Design an enzyme around this catalytic site. Structure first.
Site: not given
Length: 129
Positions: A35, A46, A48, A50, A52, A59, A101
């Site tokens: 990563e 990104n 989008d 967001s 990381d 994120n 989760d």
């Protein structure tokens, strides 16, 4: 800060990731190799809205607030900047958080594509742990 792989194994060991939710220490080292290449400071911004952030690449839509991400839940309850520290605590309490989760270690697309079949114990062979 960029870690050695043995020096991140041991920190991670210390911060009790060795066998949390059933994931060997060894996977956790792999997940951060692929990563961010062990860089505490890494970010991938990104299309989008967001980003990381940090060594395990968490994120902003889901896990931290950085005040600029669209649909934000800040489920770790930490600023994302908290995750670019040179110290890896804020990121390990946040991976522990994600992994509760619905965890896979699947949450992390590099662990799925590059750590998931292998011999991940290989990333800790030779360290003192």
């Amino acid at each position: 800060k960029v870690f050695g792989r043995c020096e991140l194994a041991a920190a991670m060991k210390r911060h009790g990731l060795d066998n949390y939710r059933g994931y060997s220490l060894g996977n956790w080292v792999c997940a951060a190799k692929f990563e961010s290449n062990f860089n505490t400071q890494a970010t991938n911004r990104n299309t989008d809205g967001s980003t990381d952030y940090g060594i395990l690449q968490i994120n902003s839509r889901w896990w931290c607030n950085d005040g600029r991400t669209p649909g934000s839940r800040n489920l770790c309850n930490i600023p994302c900047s908290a995750l670019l520290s040179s110290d890896i605590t804020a990121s390990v309490n946040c991976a522990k958080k994600i992994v509760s989760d619905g965890n896979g270690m699947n949450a992390w697309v590099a662990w799925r594509n590059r750590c998931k079949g292998t011999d991940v114990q290989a990333w800790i062979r030779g360290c003192r742990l």
